[PDB]
Amino acid sequence: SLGAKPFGEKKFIEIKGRRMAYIDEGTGDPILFQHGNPTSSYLWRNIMPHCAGLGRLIACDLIGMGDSDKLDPSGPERYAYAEHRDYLDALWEALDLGDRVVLVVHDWGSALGFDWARRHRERVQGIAYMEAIAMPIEWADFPEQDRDLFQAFRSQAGEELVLQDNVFVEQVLPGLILRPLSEAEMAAYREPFLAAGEARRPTLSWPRQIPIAGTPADVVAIARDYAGWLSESPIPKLFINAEPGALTTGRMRDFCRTWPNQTEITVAGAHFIQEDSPDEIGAAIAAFVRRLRPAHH
């Protein structure tokens, strides 16, 4: 259903000195749901129930996000892709996931999960993705309506826009959900970013890592590598397409449609499509997993 309640209470593991938070429910091989910017495990609350009894249902909060601890010191060099990967790789190792993981990914969760999959391919049973950073892009490929604002985040304007005015949370997020959010929903998204200043840095560092027009070169190289790998990987895939969508449209969507061993559905939504079409998304994921894990009830 739609609904503002969280899916479970947070659990905690110590990673590199910092407590990291994650949702963990059920038993069996993992189904690992990974949010991006500026969300948390909360993004998946109405999707995870569809997988009840199909696996161990896990949704991690990235470092500095959700209920995971903030890094200190923080500033413009903090919360880059590589640092998020360092923490997330360690958390995923700590969770004792085994070798039949189904990844369910969105936004920067897809960049992180696609790279992890490339590096751990024998451990990935299937990949469900939506509104993903599937490859390096050009500014022409970026949604027109928020193009100027994302170039501003990437400029020195970003500190005022995000650290002081919290634009990513307060404007971009609700602007890329078709339906109006309730107070309680918006409160869950605001919670990690209530405080002005470096508490909000993850939401500014993230748009500064998007691989656009060859910059930043280090993330472009990472995405070029997972794009090349996914396009010839035999791992089963589920592409949850969106209309109108946002990022996984145009050239990127065409590229994703070339990937082998893939199923597709289309749901209504812009970018944070989990808030518009959770039951359609969840049902597709559950069907995918049932195929991958035949129960013979």
Interacting partner of 216 out of Mg ion, Cl ion, none (Cβ under 5 to 8 A depending on kind): Cl ion
Helices 217-230 and 107-119, axial angle in degrees (round to 10) = 70
Q: Which of 213, 217, 261, 291 binds Cl ion (CB under 5 A)?
A: 217
Stretch that binds Cl ion, among 2-10, 178-186, 210-218, 222-230 (CB under 5 A): 210-218
The one-letter code for the residue type at 111 is A
Contact between 221 and Cl ion (CB under 5 A)?
no
**Token representation of residue 189:** 């998204």
Closest to 93 (Cα-Cα) out of 60, 54, 131: 60
From the list 259, 40, 76, 85, the residue with the least C-alpha distance to 155 is 76
Distances (CA, A) of 270 to 118, 159, 174, 244: 27, 26, 10, 5
Is 4 within 8 Å of 185 (Cβ atoms)?
yes
Answer for the pair 101, 123: CB distance below 8 angstroms, yes or no: yes
Q: Is 296 a catalytic residue?
A: no
Window of 35-43, 44-52, 117-125, 278-286 that interacts with Cl ion by CB under 5 A: 35-43
* Partner whose binding site includes residue 37, from Mg ion, Cl ion, none (CB under 5 to 8 Å by kind): Cl ion
Among 28, 143, 174, 216, binds Cl ion (CB under 5 A): 216
Q: Which does 215 bind (CB under 5 to 8 A by kind): Cl ion, Mg ion, none?
A: Cl ion
Nearest residue (CB) to Mg ion, 12 versus 139: 12
Residues 153-182 that bind Cl ion (CB under 5 A): none
- Write the CA distances from 96 to 22, 32, 86, 91, integer angstroms: 14, 12, 16, 9
CB-wise, 36 or 278, nearer to Cl ion? 36
Q: Annotated catalytic, 120?
A: no
Q: By CB under 5 A, is residue 206 in contact with Cl ion?
A: yes
Residues within the interface to Mg ion (CB under 5 A): 19
Which of 106, 115, 271, 275 is catalytic? The answer is: 271
**Residues at the interface with Cl ion (CB under 5 A):** 37, 206-207, 215-217
Q: Which amino acids are annotated catalytic?
A: 107, 131, 271
